[PDB]
Amino acid sequence: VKKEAAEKLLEKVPSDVLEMYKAIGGKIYIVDGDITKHISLEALSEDKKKIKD
Amino acid sequence: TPITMNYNQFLELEKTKQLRLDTDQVYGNIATYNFENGRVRVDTGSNWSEV
């Protein structure tokens, strides 16, 4: 009789395609602190306000 | 900026539903009568904290 030999049908593995999608990449955006300056006097005042006759 | 709450306080609030509010002190001014024109005018300098 003649031997099969068996060279196989399956080629490589999914693992390369699996690794392709497995890509995670970079996520999220900068927020919160930004720059922050601010300056004006809407908080408190100062002006002569007494009483007399 | 809005009020911030962390994680453990958030869990404790959603468990216990106990969130109370205290009034520590109140700022506020006096308006005084003017003998000049009768108009009662606010002194922004003076406050009821003095009084």
Q: What SS3 string covers B1-51?
A: CCCCCCHHHHHHHHHHCCCCCCCCCCCCEEEECCCCCCCCEEEEEEEHHHC
Q: Exposed (0-12), middle (13-18) or buried (19+): which is B45, by Cβ within 10 Å?
A: middle
From chain B, the residues in CB contact with A53 under 8 A are 35
The experimental method, as deposited, was cryo-EM
> Across-strand partners of B30?
B43
What is the structure's resolution, reported in angstroms to one decimal?
Answer: 3.3
Q: Note whether B35 and B41 are within 8 A (CB).
A: no
Residue of A42, A49, A52 to mutate when probing chain B, most B C-beta within 10 A: A49
Q: Note whether B7 and A8 are within 8 A (CB).
A: no
From chain A, the residues in CB contact with B34 under 8 A are 51
The two tokens of residue B48 are: 């009821």
